[PDB]
Amino acid sequence: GKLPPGPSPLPVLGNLLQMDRKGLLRSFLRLREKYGDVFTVYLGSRPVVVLCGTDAIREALVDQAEAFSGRGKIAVVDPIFQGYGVIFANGERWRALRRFSLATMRDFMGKRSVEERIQEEARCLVEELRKSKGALLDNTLLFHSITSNIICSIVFGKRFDYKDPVFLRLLDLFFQSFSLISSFSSQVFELFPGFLKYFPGTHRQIYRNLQEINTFIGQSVEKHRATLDPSNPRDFIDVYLLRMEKDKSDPSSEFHHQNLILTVLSLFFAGTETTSTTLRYGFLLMLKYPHVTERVQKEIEQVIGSHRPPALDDRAKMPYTDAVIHEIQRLGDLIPFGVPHTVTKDTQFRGYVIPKNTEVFPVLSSALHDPRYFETPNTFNPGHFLDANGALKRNEGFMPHSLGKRICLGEGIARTELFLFFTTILQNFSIASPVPPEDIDLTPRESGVGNVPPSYQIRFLAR
């Protein structure tokens, strides 16, 4: 049959000349108004089926879950990952890695739970912020550090002190790669990769930094193997090393060294930046709307008090705080175009045929701003997640972690980090900044990865 409708492309530039300079998101919104919720666009010579609106996204990712469960390539990082690791794998390799990862992170190993690790990280964070004594800070580094430390706890069985210089050198290297992957020069590399990969550019810096991180990950794996107690696995690496030994004879097995290194690197890639940025965005909103922040603090005081630290069971009793977090994620809209998918076979969708391995973009932003589900889509409104009796309510438009078979693997971990970090910080500190609330601008910069909140200063004032 045929592909969904769309603008007429050019030989090598596809529809790039027809794009809007305001961003890809604005262009898709204009293209939606002309062709509907599902359309085809050529970014270079690459055909992409774009899904707009809650319906088209749910029909694809949920109703034909298996058909839309493929993962599309990110060219700037494909030389490192090469289809290994949980985020970039496909087929049987993906199924085995995802099953194993889910179980390991869920049905753990180690001593303490993920929640207990997050509570300990939150306690360390409070002590570090107390030491600041209300000085102006840029919270980017600390929020990168706490989220990295959660992943470290899971994969390496330990956390790092916030001032550990070797931890900070590799962290800087990792987050620089993130800023580079998302730059305009990397966006251009994604459009004309086969050509641009022969000249100097950000792709070389990304590659060098990640090979350095992979070297460190490799050394940790060897060190885990040399100090291994098979009856007491400490973390993800130990559990994976035991599975490698169990599958030693099976040559079909995916449980090898490359999948280990790149699965660990994948967890840092997926599990740090978005969580950190959600926190950064949330604190910016809390500066802009002090009456919301005040109300969260009142709810913390009523349910938790000022003595004990927040625990995950407290969330069920704090619908206002829970609604605020949902609204931070919704308005934050940090992954506006989703993470690219592909169809795993020639697929029939709304009368069209999407050929096998065609790339698909589920535009999560169009669900997060859907006027069917949100009364004031462009305005911060916790009421979007509260019913007339003040209880938390479910919303079909709320999909910041996507849907279907590729749904965010760490959703439960991320949601727990948001709850415990926001409440533990606010239980102990009030916030201020040199910019008056009325002058705070929440407009993001659209980057390669997603929406980047502006940089800002903040004070954490002990209570």
Report the interface residues with ligand HEM, using CB under 6 A. 71, 86-87, 98, 266-267, 270-271, 274-275, 278, 334-335, 338-339, 341, 400-402, 406, 408-410, 413-414
Tally Cβ neighbours within 10 Å of residue 128: 16
- Among ligand HEM, ligand CM5, none, the one that 406 touches (CB under a kind-dependent 5 to 8 A) is ligand HEM
Return the H-helix or E-strand segment holding 41: strand 38-43
Which amino acid is located at 394 in the chain? R
185 near ligand CM5, judged by CB under 6 A = no
Quote the CA–CA distance of 22 and 225 in Å, as a whole number.
Answer: 50
Residue 219: both structure tokens together: 């050394």
CB of 104 to ligand HEM, least distance (A): 11
Tally Cβ neighbours within 10 Å of residue 13: 16
Determine how β-strand 359-362 pairs with β-strand 46-51. parallel
Residue 175: both structure tokens together: 């987050």
Strand order in the sheet with 359-362: 38-43, 46-51, 359-362, 341-342, 70-71
| Region 308-347 residues binding ligand CM5, contact defined as CB under 6 A | 335, 337-340
- Given the complex with ligand HEM, which of 236 and 460 has the nearer CB atom? 236
- Binding residue (CB under 6 A) for ligand CM5 from 122, 125, 262, 270: 270
| Residue 408 annotated as lining a ligand binding site | yes
CB of 72 to ligand HEM, least distance (A): 9
| Region 57-96 residues binding ligand CM5, contact defined as CB under 6 A | 74, 87
- Among ligand HEM, ligand CM5, none, the one that 360 touches (CB under a kind-dependent 5 to 8 A) is none
- Given the complex with ligand HEM, which of 32 and 341 has the nearer CB atom? 341
Distance of CA 221 to the CA centre of its chain: 25
Binding residues for ligand CM5, total number by CB under 6 A: 25
Sign of the torsion angle spanned by Cα atoms 64, 67, 69, 75? negative
Which of 382, 410, 422 is CA-nearest to residue 398?
A: 382
- Binding residue (CB under 6 A) for ligand CM5 from 39, 100, 143, 268: 268
Residue 236: both structure tokens together: 């993800």
Tally Cβ neighbours within 10 Å of residue 447: 17
- Among ligand HEM, ligand CM5, none, the one that 448 touches (CB under a kind-dependent 5 to 8 A) is ligand CM5
Asked if 34 and 20 touch (Cβ cutoff 8 Å), the reply is no
- Binding residue (CB under 6 A) for ligand CM5 from 166, 229, 389, 443: 166
| 27-35, 108-116, 124-132, 170-178 -> range binding ligand CM5 (CB under 6 A) | 170-178
Q: Kindly give the residue spans of alpha helices, DSSP state H, lying in 247-405.
A: 257-271, 273-288, 290-303, 319-332, 364-368
- Binding residues for heme, as ranges, are 408
Annotation: binding site: 408
Residue ranges that bind ligand CM5, judged by CB under 6 A: 74, 87, 148, 152, 160, 166-167, 170-171, 174, 187, 190, 213, 268-270, 335, 337-340, 361, 448-450
